[PDB]
Structure to design on (110 residues):
């Protein structure tokens, strides 16, 4: 909904970009410094979020 | 008669023309406000620029 845009079209793209048609689960051990809760499945985004 | 005025060649008679109005703008007319917002019109046009170009303030 663009007020000053053209008439016939309004693209309106989505916020993100991926399909997640298939999923993979990785199970292992962690250390004390980890902040993630134990025994609770959580989604992983990218390597920048790891370590902490 | 006329009233003479000093001149490089002695005492001469002076006068005036009538305003023409074909003088290009001088340094004085130029101002930062004048053209700072002006270049916002050099950008392209589309849904990605309409809102941004409208909300330009200085």
């Amino acid at each position: 909904a663009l007020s000053d845009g053209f008439v016939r079209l309004c693209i309106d793209p989505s916020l993100n970009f991926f399909g997640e048609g298939c999923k993979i689960l990785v199970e292992g051990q962690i250390t004390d410094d980890a902040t993630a809760a134990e025994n609770v499945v959580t989604c992983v985004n990218s390597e920048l979020d790891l370590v902490e | 008669m006329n009233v003479l005025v000093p001149g490089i060649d002695g005492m001469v008679s002076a006068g005036k023309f009538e305003y023409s109005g074909c003088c290009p703008p001088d340094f004085a007319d130029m101002d930062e406000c004048t053209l700072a917002t002006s270049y916002v019109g050099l950008l392209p046009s589309g849904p990605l620029w309409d809102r941004a170009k409208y909300e330009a303030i200085t």
In short: Chain A touches chain B through five residues (CB under 8 Å). DSSP finds no helices and no strands in chain A. The two ends of chain A are 40 Å apart (CA to CA). The CA atoms of residues 26 and 41 of chain A lie 10 Å apart.
